[PDB]
Design an enzyme around this catalytic site. Structure first.
Site, PDB file in Angstrom:
ATOM      1  N   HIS B  41       0.814  -1.213   0.000  1.00  0.00           N
ATOM      2  CA  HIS B  41       0.000   0.000   0.000  1.00  0.00           C
ATOM      3  C   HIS B  41       0.853   1.271   0.000  1.00  0.00           C
ATOM      4  CE1 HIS B  41      -0.191  -0.233   4.552  1.00  0.00           C
ATOM      5  NE2 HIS B  41       0.176   1.032   4.373  1.00  0.00           N
ATOM      6  N   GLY B 143       2.245   6.160   9.547  1.00  0.00           N
ATOM      7  CA  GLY B 143       3.670   6.127   9.258  1.00  0.00           C
ATOM      8  C   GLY B 143       4.350   4.882   9.820  1.00  0.00           C
ATOM      9  N   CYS B 145       3.543   1.788   9.301  1.00  0.00           N
ATOM     10  CA  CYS B 145       3.458   0.632   8.408  1.00  0.00           C
ATOM     11  C   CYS B 145       4.822   0.189   7.931  1.00  0.00           C
ATOM     12  CB  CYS B 145       2.503   0.900   7.254  1.00  0.00           C
ATOM     13  SG  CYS B 145       0.840   1.346   7.797  1.00  0.00           S
TER      14      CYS B 145
END
Ligand SMILES: COc1ccc2nnn(CC(=O)N(Cc3ccccn3)c3ccc(C4CCNCC4)cc3)c2c1
Ligand SMILES: COc1ccc2nnn(CC(=O)N(Cc3ccccn3)c3ccc(C4CCNCC4)cc3)c2c1
Lengths: 304, 304
Positions: B41, B143, B145
């Site tokens: 993503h 942030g 991830c």
């Protein structure tokens, strides 16, 4: 979202851990620049740990009696000295992995991460608070001595603790990096009173603000209180008296949530008088006091 | 003595964290050998995170659109590919700090440490369990991830988790290092049911054994039970059914304490039916399920 008992990343400290052996005793040391710091009781046997004369014991030791190993490589000891309850072994090599560091003496109620080590090797990392009574409730087994506590601000490691002993009560005691014990403790195997511990009120309030930020709000009420009224409740429940300095440190969290500090004190007062009634806050069934207001803001803002 | 929610020392993982940027999205990647792994993503904007066609989105991206930075130095991307929900960016430089590692897919109820990162920089480390419903209750902000979960056995890091998302319920979901989600979750901003969570019975029993080893014994009773009787109680309290495999894994702790596993089940049965009555176990007012039997033995034996 989510709130966890988070420790600082331990890599910068892992690079400083060494094994120190003297006679038949082995514990951990901290290698920073060309000095290795370790508890002075590394020179003790079991026959003299009951009442050691550290000065007399150290006189029978030479540089070559202190065996310092960094992983698989042996360090050459070229000097030794005792500063309070720590030994400083000067080595001929500066640690290439020495981070930017400071030695700090933390205040009671402040938090720090502990890197538990055995034989100079890191086993785990956890966050804890220095209790108001200057003990820590850690996880330390025989061989863990010399493991350190620290905080990290960007690239700087502030070492605040070095582990020295476990009291007969199972709580832990140690020193700052100048070898000064936190609290009344001595490095002797004798009965030692820790004294009354209290709950760190400012940290419980900080955690209540963390709970509100993360959605746990059931405990918020329609009440307020005063510092004097709240402190009458705090005294009865063995909580530290809250001061205006504590209210001021809670300012950012009060501003972020829009909940006045005295209103949060009133929520805490009701939780102390009524209990949790079988409910939880941030996955805890008790009031947590191991997060400072700085920690809540750091964790809630993602500071690296 | 003492028992803490201990995380593995994070240094070996800190040396693998990098920042990955694609377009205007920035998250963390894991640099092992000459490959950087990150959530796919990273290629999404906010207009397509609702229902992304990852194949179509990735086709509009070239090697030069993936900006990978390791501290202050830029890595050159020479290949990119999607494997399930992760992207693998081949770089021209092998990470000099790559530890011995494996990619493992953990079982529900197993534990691991998470190194929370922002912009490729480590912020903190905590221990958690993969819930029976394949979510984790972490601490992750925007942030985070690409932050990973792992276990360490001596010098080998077993990466088991990569963070991808926070569900509307505030719990966390992610993948193994091959990009396969744990649980039914998809990497889309849509409503997603996590399903009924249960308490990890074998871990609660392991923690009860840890409590006995460390002196908290008030909960021990004069009773015993059977697996079938205990599982009737477990069903009523949304605890995982205990199997003989669980009893077998508890063997070392049962042998160390001299408390038969079914006797400890009877203590747990009484704690479930009566509650704690305002008492605590290892500083907790609830039954803790984030320590496996392996963790209790490791922490109680000082494995480094
Ligand atoms: C046994 O289990 C634990 C568990 C957790 C522990 N945290 N710390 N300590 C160490 C500890 O408290 N002491 C007491 C003490 C006495 C004098 C000076 C300072 N402290 C200690 C110190 C040195 C020695 C050595 C003697 C020579 N042989 C090798 C061990 C033995 C005990 C732990 C011990
Ligand atoms: C906002 O607070 C949090 C807090 C904790 C968090 N843990 N993870 N996430 C990320 C997350 O769940 N999503 C949802 C989602 C949608 C599609 C695919 C996968 N996941 C997400 C993913 C990407 C983006 C980017 C779009 C482009 N601009 C830059 C952000 C925004 C949200 C968190 C967000």
């Amino acid at each position: 979202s989510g709130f966890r008992k988070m420790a600082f990343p331990s890599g910068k400290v892992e690079g400083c851990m060494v094994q120190v052996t003297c006679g038949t005793t082995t514990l951990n040391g901290l290698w920073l620049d060309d000095v290795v710091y370790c508890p002075r009781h590394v020179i003790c046997t079991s026959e003299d740990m009951l009442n050691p004369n550290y000065e007399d014991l150290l006189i029978r030791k030479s540089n070559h009696n202190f065996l310092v190993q960094a992983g698989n490589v042996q360090l050459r000891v070229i000097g030794h000295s005792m500063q309070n309850c720590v030994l400083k072994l000067k080595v001929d090599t500066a640690n290439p992995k020495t981070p930017k560091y400071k030695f700090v003496r933390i205040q009671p109620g402040q938090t720090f991460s502990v890197l538990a080590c055995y034989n100079g090797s890191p086993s785990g990392v956890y966050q804890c608070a220095m209790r108001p009574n200057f003990t820590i409730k850690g996880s330390f087994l025989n061989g863990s001595c010399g493991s350190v506590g620290f905080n990290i601000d960007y690239d700087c490691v502030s070492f605040c603790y070095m582990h020295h002993m476990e009291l007969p009560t199972g709580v832990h005691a140690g020193t700052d990096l100048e070898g000064n014990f936190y609290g009344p403790f001595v490095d002797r195997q004798t009965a030692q009173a820790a004294g009354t511990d209290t709950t760190i009120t400012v940290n419980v309030l900080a955690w209540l603000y963390a709970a509100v930020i993360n959605g746990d709000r059931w405990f918020l009420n329609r009440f307020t209180t005063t510092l004097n009224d709240f402190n009458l409740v705090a005294m009865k429940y063995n909580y530290e008296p809250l001061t205006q300095d504590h209210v001021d440190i809670l300012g950012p969290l009060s501003a972020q949530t829009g909940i006045a500090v005295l209103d949060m004190c009133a929520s805490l007062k009701e939780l102390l008088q009524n209990g949790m009634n079988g409910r939880t806050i941030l996955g805890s069934a008790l009031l947590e006091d191991e997060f400072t207001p700085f920690d809540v803001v750091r964790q809630c803002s993602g500071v690296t």
